[PDB]
Design an enzyme around this catalytic site. Structure first.
Site, PDB file in Angstrom:
ATOM      1  N   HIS A   1       0.845  -1.228   0.000  1.00 51.79           N
ATOM      2  CA  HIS A   1       0.000   0.000   0.000  1.00 51.79           C
ATOM      3  C   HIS A   1       0.870   1.264   0.000  1.00 51.79           C
ATOM      4  O   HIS A   1       0.297   2.366  -0.134  1.00 51.79           O
ATOM      5  CB  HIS A   1      -1.074  -0.034   1.082  1.00 51.79           C
ATOM      6  CG  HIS A   1      -0.567   0.053   2.478  1.00 51.79           C
ATOM      7  ND1 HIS A   1      -0.985  -0.810   3.470  1.00 51.79           N
ATOM      8  CD2 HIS A   1       0.303   0.905   3.049  1.00 51.79           C
ATOM      9  CE1 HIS A   1      -0.401  -0.478   4.602  1.00 51.79           C
ATOM     10  NE2 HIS A   1       0.402   0.560   4.369  1.00 51.79           N
TER      11      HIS A   1
ATOM     12  N   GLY B   1       2.427   6.101  10.099  1.00 48.54           N
ATOM     13  CA  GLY B   1       3.873   6.053   9.834  1.00 48.54           C
ATOM     14  C   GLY B   1       4.474   4.704  10.199  1.00 48.54           C
ATOM     15  O   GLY B   1       5.562   4.385   9.666  1.00 48.54           O
TER      16      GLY B   1
ATOM     17  N   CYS C   1       3.596   1.618   9.555  1.00 45.63           N
ATOM     18  CA  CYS C   1       3.475   0.495   8.591  1.00 45.63           C
ATOM     19  C   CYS C   1       4.875   0.063   8.136  1.00 45.63           C
ATOM     20  O   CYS C   1       5.773   0.927   7.973  1.00 45.63           O
ATOM     21  CB  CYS C   1       2.548   0.840   7.436  1.00 45.63           C
ATOM     22  SG  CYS C   1       0.809   0.862   7.935  1.00 45.63           S
TER      23      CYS C   1
END
Length: 305
Positions: free
Chosen positions: A41, A143, A145
């Protein structure tokens, strides 16, 4: 003595964390040998996440669109591929700090350490469990991820989790390092709800053994039970069924304390039906289920890495 929620030392993993940017999206990557692993993503806009076609979005991306920074120094991206829900960015430099490592897929009930990162920089380390509903109860801000979960076996890091998303109930979903989600979750902003958060029975029993080893003994009673009788009561309280395999796994803690597993089950049955009556076990007023039998043996015997 004492018993704490203890994480693995993070040094080996701190050495693998990088920053990955695609357009306006910045998150964390894992740099092992000449590959950087990150959530796919990274290629999505906020709008894209409502209904992303990842294969279609990826066609618009070239190697030079993936910005990878390892502590202030830029890495050159020479290849990219999607594997399930992760991107694999090939870089022209092998990570000189790459530890011995493995990619594992863990079972519900298993614990791991999380190195929470922002902009490729470690923030903190904490212990988690894979819940029976395949969520984790982490601590993750925007942030975070690409933060990873891991276990260490002496010098070998087993990576088991990469962080992807938060459910509006405040619990966390992610993938193994082959990019497969734990549980039914997908990387799309669509209605997804966690199932029942059942209690990991074998882990509660491990933690009761930990309490006895550390002198916390008020909950020991004069009773015993059977697996079938214990499970009748456990099921009522959304506890996982206990199996003969679980009994075998608790063998070492049974042997260390001289308390039979079925006697400890009888103590747990009484705690479930009676409650704590305002008393504490190892500084908790709840039955703790995020210590595995292996975790208790490790902490009570002082195993090092």
């Amino acid at each position: 003595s004492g018993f704490r929620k203890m994480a693995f030392p993070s040094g080996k993993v701190e050495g693998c964390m990088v920053q990955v940017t695609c357009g306006t999206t910045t998150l964390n990557g894992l740099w092992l040998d000449d590959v950087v692993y990150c959530p796919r993503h990274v290629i999505c806009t906020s709008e894209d996440m409502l209904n992303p076609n990842y294969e279609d979005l990826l066609i618009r991306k070239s190697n030079h669109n993936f910005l990878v920074q390892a502590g202030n120094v830029q890495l050159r991206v020479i290849g990219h591929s999607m594997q399930n829900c992760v991107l694999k960015l090939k870089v022209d430099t092998a990570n000189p700090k790459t530890p011995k490592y493995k990619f594992v897929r863990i079972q519900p009930g298993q614990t791991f350490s999380v190195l929470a990162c922002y902009n490729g920089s470690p923030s903190g380390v904490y212990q988690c469990a894979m819940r029976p509903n395949f969520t984790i109860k982490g601590s993750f801000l925007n942030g975070s991820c690409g933060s990873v979960g891991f276990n260490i076996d002496y010098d070998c890091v087993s990576f088991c989790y990469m962080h992807h998303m938060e459910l509006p109930t405040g619990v966390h979903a992610g993938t193994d390092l082959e990019g497969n989600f734990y549980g039914p979750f997908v990387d799309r902003q669509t209605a997804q709800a966690a199932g029942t958060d059942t209690t990991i029975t074998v882990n509660v029993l491990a933690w009761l053994y930990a309490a006895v080893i550390n002198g916390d003994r008020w909950f020991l009673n004069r009773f015993t039970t059977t697996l079938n009788d214990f499970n009748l009561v456990a099921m009522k309280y959304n506890y996982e069924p206990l199996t003969q395999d679980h009994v075998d796994i608790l063998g070492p803690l049974s042997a260390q304390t001289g308390i039979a597993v079925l006697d400890m089950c009888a103590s747990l049955k009484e705690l479930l039906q009676n409650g704590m009556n305002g008393r504490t076990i190892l500084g908790s007023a709840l039955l703790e289920d995020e210590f595995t039998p292996f975790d208790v043996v490790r902490q009570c015997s002082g195993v090092t890495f």
